[PDB]
Amino acid sequence: KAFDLVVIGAGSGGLEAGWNAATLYGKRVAVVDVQTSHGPPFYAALGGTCVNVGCVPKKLMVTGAQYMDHLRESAGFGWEFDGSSVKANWKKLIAAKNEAVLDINKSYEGMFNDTEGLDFFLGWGSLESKNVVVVRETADPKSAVKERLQADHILLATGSWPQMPAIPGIEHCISSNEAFYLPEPPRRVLTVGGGFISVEFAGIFNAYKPPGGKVTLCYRNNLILRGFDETIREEVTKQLTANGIEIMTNENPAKVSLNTDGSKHVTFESGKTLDVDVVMMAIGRIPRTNDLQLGNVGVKLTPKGGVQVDEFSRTNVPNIYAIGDITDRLMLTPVAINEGAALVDTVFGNKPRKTDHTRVASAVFSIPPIGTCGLIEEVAAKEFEKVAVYMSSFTPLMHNISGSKYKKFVAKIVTNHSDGTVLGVHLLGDGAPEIIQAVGVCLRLNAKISDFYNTIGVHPTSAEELCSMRTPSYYYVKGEKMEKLP
């Protein structure tokens, strides 16, 4: 019952810290989670949100959804078949995803078995005191203690949870959690939200809808994918619309009622209505702090609800740290993992390292997908006197032949024009998430535009466009956009 490190949440951040502490520094590690494998009732499990109801199953489902485009696009390359025989079997996809995720859950059980000191505990972690975590049978703090763990160090890694707007009929709606387990593909679906989860799921549902199907994505403001490059936001909107998805912007559900046939009658704030089979809310995720009983030891939360941390993931309470989505910053698996790896290399390695939250490569598995690293030009323009924007945008040749002429590839490099330093790279098109990874390494190395354009292209690729841009398309000078420098 005595551990160097007790981790609450066997997720992206929690397991990296757990496994590292044990294998690298022969530390004695306890990890708590509420469930050992994916799905209802608690959805996240051993492996965390990404593994169970996040990056992993989503990527499999987007890959499945991509075949709608491949099957059509093949005809341009001379592939012939009975188009009238094509069916998308959602049930097959969900059974395949379930088996793939279960194998990962079991893979992690294997890890915790084949690794000394590293031990898993099942049930709900909360803080008794500075150096004791209690594992209960439920999230009710009045339920039975299963174990009481002694810890020289406590890591909060409980991740996040979908936010459900408190509207009349919210109980008729789902989150991404339930989306992963729908027994049938919805004919008509409303994805609510303008973020990556709503966009990715609109693509998934769009590919698997039965005949006479319709995917509607609504977003409360004017343009989806706030925080992404503006050119790409407008382009993804176009490319989703070109593939049959209806984008309702400046619209937001005010209430949902059940129709007598079990379908959902959505009333918008604007007074518009829409009947759908599924309303999937994807309006935000919020840190999971409630259940930890942080009041007991007085861990400070933020004006937003995330565990407040310093650059070393340290709470106001010594020996207590927080990584990943509970900190309510960048909600990404590799950031959680980076933070856990840094926390452990610091505390147990005696080799203090802090996660860099700048110049983080990330993606949206939209069809086609986004790959991005570093600053969008609007943000660059407010920090740097002179910003240059290099832009190349064209339908790649293969997509003129494929018949998907609407698949414009967008490559944008944003620089500090004073020294040529690359501040951000923004890609939209097939392979963008793969292209951007090594760009993250370039930005860590303070790559300039001349490092890109003096590197020899790989031909033919979309990526080589990044090594072909010598001349700014336009500038920001003290915030002001203009074609030419003064």
Ligand X SMILES: CC(=O)Nc1ccncc1C
Q: Are 370 and 236 in contact (CB under 8 A)?
A: yes
Nearest to 90 by CA among 68, 72, 74, 69: 68
Q: Is 415 left (phi over 0), alpha (psi -120 to 50) or beta?
A: beta
459 given a catalytic annotation: yes
For residue 155 the two structure tokens come to 């890591």
In the shown chain, the binding pattern of residues 166 to 205 toward a second copy, with x for contact by CB under 8 A and - for none, equals: ----------------------------------------
Report d(CA 98, CA 224) in Å as an integer.
Answer: 30
Residue of 201, 235, 248 whose CA lies nearest to 406? 235
Least distance (Å) from a second copy to the CB of residue 227? Answer: 16
- From 221, 241, 400, 455, residue interacting with Br ion (rule: CB under 5 A): 221
Q: What is the rounded (10 degree) CA torsion for 117, 350, 339, 292?
A: 60
The interface partner of residue 49, options being Br ion, Mg ion, ligand FAD, none and the CB cut-off 5 to 8 Å by kind, is ligand FAD
Closest of 246, 191, 194, 244 to residue 224, by C-alpha: 194
Kindly state whether residue 223 participates in binding Br ion, applying the rule CB under 5 A. Answer: yes
Is 201 annotated as contributing to ligand binding? no
In the list 89, 222, 257, 468, the residue contacting Br ion (rule: CB under 5 A) is 222
Adjacent-strand bridge partners of 415: 388, 422
56 sits near a second copy (criterion: CB under 8 A):
yes
**What does the alpha-carbon distance between residue 351 and residue 270 come to, in Å, rounded to a whole number?**
56
Binding mask 412-451 for a second copy (x = CB under 8 A): -------------------x-xxxxxxxxxx-xx-x---x
- Pick from 36, 37, 115, 293 the residue near Mg ion by CB under 5 A: 115
**Any contact of residue 125 with ligand FAD (CB under 6 A)?**
yes
Beta-bridge partner residues of 267: 255, 273
Can you tell me which of 3, 21, 29, 58 binds ligand FAD, judged by CB under 6 A?
Answer: 58
Residue whose structure tokens are 């407040």: 308
Buried/exposed 342-367: b ≥16 CB within 10 Å, e otherwise: bbbbbbbbeeeeebeeebbbbbbbbb
Decide: is 111 part of the binding site for Mg ion (CB under 5 A). Answer: no
Strands 421-428 and 29-33: unpaired
| Min CB(350)–ligand FAD separation in Å | 24
Query: Rule CB under 6 A: which residues touch ligand X?
Result: 345, 449-450, 453-454, 470
The CA distance from 103 to 118, in Å, is: 20
147 is in an annotated binding site: no
Residues that bind Mg ion (CB under 5 A): 112, 115, 118-119
Binding-site residues for FAD sit at 59, 125, 158-160, 325
Residues that bind ligand FAD (CB under 6 A): 8-14, 32-35, 42, 44-45, 48-50, 53-55, 58, 124-125, 157-159, 176, 197, 288, 291-292, 324-326, 331-334, 336, 459
Residues labelled as active-site residues: 459
